[PDB]
Amino acid sequence: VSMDDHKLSLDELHRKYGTDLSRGLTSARAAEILARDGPNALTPPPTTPEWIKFCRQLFGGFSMLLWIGAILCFLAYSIQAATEEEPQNDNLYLGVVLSAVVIITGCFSYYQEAKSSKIMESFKNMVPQQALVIRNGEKMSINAEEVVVGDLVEVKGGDRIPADLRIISANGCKVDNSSLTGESEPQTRSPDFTNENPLETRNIAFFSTNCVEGTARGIVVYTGDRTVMGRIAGQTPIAAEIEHFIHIITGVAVFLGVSFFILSLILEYTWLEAVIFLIGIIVANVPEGLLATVTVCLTLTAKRMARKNCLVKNLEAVETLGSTSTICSDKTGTLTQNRMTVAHMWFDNQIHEADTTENQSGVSFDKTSATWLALSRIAGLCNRAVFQANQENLPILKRAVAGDASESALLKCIELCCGSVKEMRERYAKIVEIPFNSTNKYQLSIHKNPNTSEPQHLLVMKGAPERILDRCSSILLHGKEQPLDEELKDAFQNAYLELGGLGERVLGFCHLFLPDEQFPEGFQFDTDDVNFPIDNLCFVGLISMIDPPRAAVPDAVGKCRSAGIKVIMVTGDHPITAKAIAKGVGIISEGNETVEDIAARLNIPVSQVNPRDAKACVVHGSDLKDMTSEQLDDILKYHTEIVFARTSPQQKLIIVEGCQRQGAIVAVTGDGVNDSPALKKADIGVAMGIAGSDVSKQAADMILLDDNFASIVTGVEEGRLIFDNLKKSIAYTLTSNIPEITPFLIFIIANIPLPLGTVTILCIDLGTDMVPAISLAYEQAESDIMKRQPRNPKTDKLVNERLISMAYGQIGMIQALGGFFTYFVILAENGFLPIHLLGLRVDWDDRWINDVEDSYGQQWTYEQRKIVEFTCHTAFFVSIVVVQWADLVICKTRRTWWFCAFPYSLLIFVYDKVRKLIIRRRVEKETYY
C-alpha cells in the first residue's frame, strides 16, 4: 500500500488541499480539520484493562501459596462439617483470614505499581514534540498533535518530520530514512520528480524521520495512522544485585520453612497446622515488596530530578547519573548565560568602555569622529537582526531581539549609543549580503553610501580579528586612512590579547570604499565571480562583548571539584578566551597553571617546561586532529583540568572515547546533530531542552529543561542518593524477619508457651511491608553527599555482610526482644510469672490437663490458658508493628502499666542507639542504629 501525491504538480496542490503554498490554510480551517480529521499520528497503541493486572497482582508471586493454604483450610472445615456435627468454626476463620491477607497484600502491591506508573508517564508531556508551521502568515510553533492535513510545515536541520510531507521548496535538505529503510545514509529531498515509487521519490518526507541538514517546506498529505510508518506495526547492575539477593533470601526462606515445618511436626502439630506454619514462614521471609520498593525509589528520585530541571528519559539513566565521573560540557548556553552584552571597544588605540546605559550615554567618549561613526555604521548595517513589532515602548535594555545573541548585543549597544538603528539602516540602502557560515569567517555586504561618495558598492564586513586583519590591509586612525605598519599590528594584537584575556568575545570590523572606475554604478555582483575586492580593506576598530557565566555555574563547578568529578570544557572558541572563561568559572582554578603560564612565569621558553609541572591544559582543536590514541590518553590522564578550545563537535566523540578508556562514567552535552554519536557513545548523554534539536533529544538519556550546567550537577547529586536509600530500604524490609522466627525458636528451646502464631506472623508481615515505601516517600537529603569520591560501578555492591548483619542481628534482635517483653508482661499480669513459664510448654499445650497452676496457686482450664495465649499473640503482633512504624517517624525526626507496649521496645531501640553512638565503630554502619 503506497499511494502518494508525488505525481501531482504545485498548481493543483492548491486545489486538492485548498491551502496557499506561501500562506498555508488559516487557523479556523486548521481547527475545523482537527475537529473533523482528528489528532496527529498518535500511533494508537494497545493496552491492558488493568483488571488483568490486578488479578495478576492478587494471584501472582508467592500469594499462590497463601491461596493454597486458604483452600486447604476451607476444605478441612468442609470435611469436618460434613463428617461430624457441631463443627468448631476455626479452619473456616483461618481460611478467611488467609484470603483477607492475600487480598490486602495484592491491594498494596497494585497501589504501589499504579503510583509508580502514574508518577512515570508524566515525563511524556514535559517536552512535547513541536512542529514548525506557518499558518496565518507567521511561522508559529503549534504542538505536533495539532498538525492537520494540508497546512505547510517547515523542517530544519535536526527536526523530526511531524507528518507525511510532499516538500514544495528545499534548501539542501537531507533526511535520515533509517527508521523506514535499513541504511542511515542521509538521502536528499527536492521538490522534483524522481522514481515513481513513493519510498524513493526524493520528494516525500516520511513521518518519524529526521532532517539531518538543510531546510525544507512541504504540504502535509497523511496525518494519523494513515502514515507510512503508522500502517506498519537488558539488565542494570542495581537490578542484577537486587535479583541475586532476592533469590538468595528466597532460598534461605524456603530452607527455614522446611526446617520449621519438620520441627513443628516433631512437636505434635496437626497436619493443617504444620502445612500452614510452613506457608506462613515462607511467605513472611521472602522479600516480595522489594522490586516495587526499588522501583518506587527510582521513580521518586526521577520525579525529584525533573523538578530540578533534569528530565531523565529512562530509569536506567537515573542509576547511571549518580555514578558519573566526567561531565565533558560545552560553553555557550551551558556554562555561560548566552546573553551577551557589549562591554569594550578598541578604536583610536584607546580601549574604550561600552558601559553607556541611561547615565552618561557617552561613557569615555560622546561622539568622537568618523572613527566611531564608521564603527557604528558597520555594526548597524552588517547585522541581520531586527526588533520584533509591538516592542517600541519598553526600554532598550529590556527589549527583545530576533537572531543571534551576538547580533542582538551589537544592535542593543549601538542603538543605545546612536539612535533608531531602524532609521539608520533604512536611510542607507542594503542590497547584497552573503550568508553567515563558519567557512569564510566574514559577513560581506554590498552597500551604497548616500552622503558624499555614492560608489554604489561598499565592503562592510565583520569577522574574527585574527583573520579580518589579514585582508583589511589599511587601517583608519582619527578618521584618516593610514597604512598598517608592524607597530599598529602589534598594538592590535595587544588589544586582542587584553580584551580576550577578560573572557570576552572579540569581533573585527574593516571596510573600504571601492573605486568607481573598476566597478561602475551598474554592476551585477555574483558570489561565484570575484567581483568585489574581498581583500585590501581598512581597519576601523574592535568590539568586545561579555558572555557572563550562569549564576549557579561556579558553585556547581566547586561541587564537582569537591565530589571528585572531572569537568572538561569543549568549546569552539579562541584558546585565550576559553582559558579566561574557564578560569572565571572554575574549570582551571587557582594555583594550577598551563605550560604556557609556567613558561611566562619562569621567563623560560615553552619547550623546556616540563609537562608534568602543569596540572591545567588547553588543547587546540586542530591539534587534537593529530594526536593518536596514546597522546590523547596521556593528555586526559596527566592533566586534571582540561579545556578543549577550537574543538569541532565531531571531535566530542574522540574526547568521550578517550575519557571512557580510563573506566570513567562520562556525561556529555548535546544541542546538535553532529553531537548525536557522542550522546550515544557516552554513558549518560545529556541533551538541551530549549536550545537543543529533536535529534539530540532523541539520542540522549537526559534532558536539561533550563540548559544550565548546574542542573547536571544537581542531577548527579540527586542520583547519588539512591545508592544509600536502597540499602536503607533493604534493611527495613529485612529487619522484620527475626521477630517472626525467634518466637518459635525460643518456644522450642526454652519450652515456653508460643509467643506468636502463624496467622499472627502473617499479620506482622502484612502490617510492616509498607515501611520501606513510606520511608522513601518521606526522606530528607543527606549532607556531605557531594563530598565523597564517585562510586565504583563494578566494585561496589548494595548488599554486604555489614548490611545483612545490621538488619538481621541487631535491629531484628531488638524488635524481637521488645515483642518478647510484651508477651512476658501480659503473661505475668495474669498470674504466670516469667520464671514459672520455663518448661510449661508441654502442659500448656495439653488439651486434657485442665489444672495448670499459676505462680499464685490458681488453676486454669485449657481454654482459659488459650485465651491468654491468643491475647499474647495479638499483643506481640501489635507491639512489633507499632514499634516498626513509630521508630520510622522518630528516626526521620531525630536524625497504668501497659507501658509494656510500644513504649518499651522504642525505649530499648533508643538506648541501643545511644550505645552504638558511643561506640563509633568503623565506614560507619551506625546510621542504621
Asked whether position 357 contacts another protein by CB under 8 A, the answer is yes
Report the nearest approach of another protein to the CB of residue 236 (Å): 27
Residue 426 binds which entry of Na ion, another protein, none, with Cβ cut-offs from 5 to 8 Å by kind?
none
User: Which stretches of the chain bind Na ion, using CB under 5 A?
Assistant: 736-737
Distances (CA, A) of 773 to 28, 165, 885: 50, 49, 12
Residue 817 binds which entry of another protein, Na ion, none, with Cβ cut-offs from 5 to 8 Å by kind?
another protein
Asked whether position 904 contacts another protein by CB under 8 A, the answer is yes
Asked whether position 343 contacts another protein by CB under 8 A, the answer is yes
Residue 821 binds which entry of another protein, Na ion, none, with Cβ cut-offs from 5 to 8 Å by kind?
another protein
Which helix (H) or strand (E) element contains residue 648? none
CB 165 within 8 Å of CB 205: yes
Question: Total binding residues for another protein by CB under 8 A?
Answer: 96
Asked whether position 924 contacts another protein by CB under 8 A, the answer is no
Q: Which stretch binds another protein (CB under 8 A): 374-382, 457-465, 533-541, 911-919?
A: 911-919
Asked whether position 580 contacts another protein by CB under 8 A, the answer is yes
Asked whether position 270 contacts another protein by CB under 8 A, the answer is no
Report the nearest approach of another protein to the CB of residue 296 (Å): 18
For Na ion, the closer CB: 108 or 525: 108
Among 781, 838, 842, 917, binds another protein (CB under 8 A): 781
CB 330 within 8 Å of CB 712: no
Give the residue from 160, 168, 171 showing the smallest Cα distance to 132. Answer: 160
Report the nearest approach of another protein to the CB of residue 677 (Å): 27
Asked whether position 359 contacts another protein by CB under 8 A, the answer is yes
Q: Residue 668 — φ and ψ, nearest 5°?
A: -125, -175
Distance CA 530, CA 527 (A): 7
Secondary structure letter of residue 362 according to DSSP? T
583 Cβ neighbours under 8 A, 6+ residues apart: 503, 589
Among 486, 863, 923, 924, binds another protein (CB under 8 A): 863
For another protein, the closer CB: 813 or 882: 813
Residue 135 binds which entry of Na ion, another protein, none, with Cβ cut-offs from 5 to 8 Å by kind?
none
| DSSP strand pairing (641-645 vs 568-571) | parallel
For Na ion, the closer CB: 79 or 252: 252
Asked whether position 548 contacts another protein by CB under 8 A, the answer is yes
Asked whether position 596 contacts another protein by CB under 8 A, the answer is no
Asked whether position 591 contacts another protein by CB under 8 A, the answer is no
Distance CA 401, CA 380 (A): 14
For another protein, the closer CB: 225 or 353: 353
Asked whether position 457 contacts another protein by CB under 8 A, the answer is no
CB 332 within 8 Å of CB 389: no
Asked whether position 365 contacts another protein by CB under 8 A, the answer is no
Surface-to-core class of residue 550, CB atoms within 10 Å of its CB (0-12 exposed, 13-18 middle, 19+ buried): buried
Distance CA 7, CA 3 (A): 10
Binding to another protein (CB under 8 A) within 50-79 occurs at: none
Among 708, 735, 742, 775, binds another protein (CB under 8 A): 708
Asked whether position 883 contacts another protein by CB under 8 A, the answer is no
Asked whether position 325 contacts another protein by CB under 8 A, the answer is no
Q: Which stretch binds another protein (CB under 8 A): 41-49, 333-341, 484-492, 788-796?
A: 333-341
For another protein, the closer CB: 479 or 501: 501
Distances (CA, A) of 400 to 387, 393, 688: 7, 11, 22
Terminal-residue alpha carbon distance, the chain: 68
Residue 742: all three cell numbers together: 525467634
Q: Which stretch binds another protein (CB under 8 A): 166-174, 674-682, 708-716, 766-774?
A: 708-716
Adjacent-strand bridge partners of 507: 543
Residue 562 binds which entry of another protein, Na ion, none, with Cβ cut-offs from 5 to 8 Å by kind?
another protein
Which helix (H) or strand (E) element contains residue 865? helix 862-894
856-875 burial string, b = 16+ CB within 10 Å, else e?
eeeebebeebeebbeebbbb
Which helix (H) or strand (E) element contains residue 114? helix 91-119
Report the nearest approach of another protein to the CB of residue 338 (Å): 9
Report the nearest approach of another protein to the CB of residue 433 (Å): 27
Q: Residue 786 — φ and ψ, nearest 5°?
A: -95, 30
Query: Residues comprising the binding site?
Result: 441, 671, 675
Residue 924 binds which entry of Na ion, another protein, none, with Cβ cut-offs from 5 to 8 Å by kind?
none
Residue 502 binds which entry of Na ion, another protein, none, with Cβ cut-offs from 5 to 8 Å by kind?
another protein
For another protein, the closer CB: 535 or 846: 846
Asked whether position 395 contacts another protein by CB under 8 A, the answer is yes
413-443 burial string, b = 16+ CB within 10 Å, else e?
bbbbbbeebeebeeebebeebeeeeeeeebb
What type of residue sits at position 113? Answer: E
For another protein, the closer CB: 13 or 814: 814
Report the nearest approach of another protein to the CB of residue 904 (Å): 6
Q: Is 330 a catalytic residue?
A: yes
For another protein, the closer CB: 89 or 518: 89
Among 46, 49, 128, 605, binds another protein (CB under 8 A): 128
Give the residue from 385, 279, 371 showing the smallest Cα distance to 340. Answer: 385
Residue 653: all three cell numbers together: 566523540
| DSSP notation for 46-99 | ----SHHHHHHHHHSTTHHHHHHHHHHHHHHHHHHHHHSSS--TTHHHHHHHHH
Asked whether position 819 contacts another protein by CB under 8 A, the answer is no
Specify the residue for cell string 504542538.
Answer: 143
For another protein, the closer CB: 357 or 493: 357
CA 53 to chain centre: 30
Distances (CA, A) of 115 to 61, 256, 886, 895: 20, 33, 24, 28
Report the nearest approach of another protein to the CB of residue 922 (Å): 12
CB 5 within 8 Å of CB 221: yes
> Active site residue: 330, 694, 765, 769, which one?
330
For another protein, the closer CB: 475 or 710: 710
For another protein, the closer CB: 622 or 858: 858
Secondary structure letter of residue 438 according to DSSP? T
477-495 burial string, b = 16+ CB within 10 Å, else e?
eeeeeeebeeebeeebeeb
Asked whether position 268 contacts another protein by CB under 8 A, the answer is no
Report the nearest approach of another protein to the CB of residue 499 (Å): 11
**What's the CA angle centered on 322, arms 317 and 323, to 5 degrees?**
95
Among 897, 920, 922, 924, binds another protein (CB under 8 A): 897
- Strand ranges for 707-834 from DSSP E: none
Among 272, 627, 849, 891, binds another protein (CB under 8 A): 849
Distance CA 654, CA 659 (A): 9
What type of residue sits at position 84? Answer: E
Asked whether position 574 contacts another protein by CB under 8 A, the answer is no
Secondary structure letter of residue 442 according to DSSP? B
Asked whether position 851 contacts another protein by CB under 8 A, the answer is yes
Q: Sketch the per residue contact string, 630 through 669, with another protein: x for CB under 8 A, - otherwise.
A: ----------------------------------------
- Count of Cβ atoms closer than 10 Å to residue 470 Cβ: 11
Query: Residues comprising the binding site for ATP?
Result: 441
CA dihedral (918, 921, 924, 929) positive or negative: negative
Report the nearest approach of another protein to the CB of residue 11 (Å): 36
Distance CA 237, CA 923 (A): 22
Binding to another protein (CB under 8 A) within 488-517 occurs at: 502-503
Asked whether position 783 contacts another protein by CB under 8 A, the answer is yes
Report the nearest approach of another protein to the CB of residue 406 (Å): 14
Residues forming the active site: 330
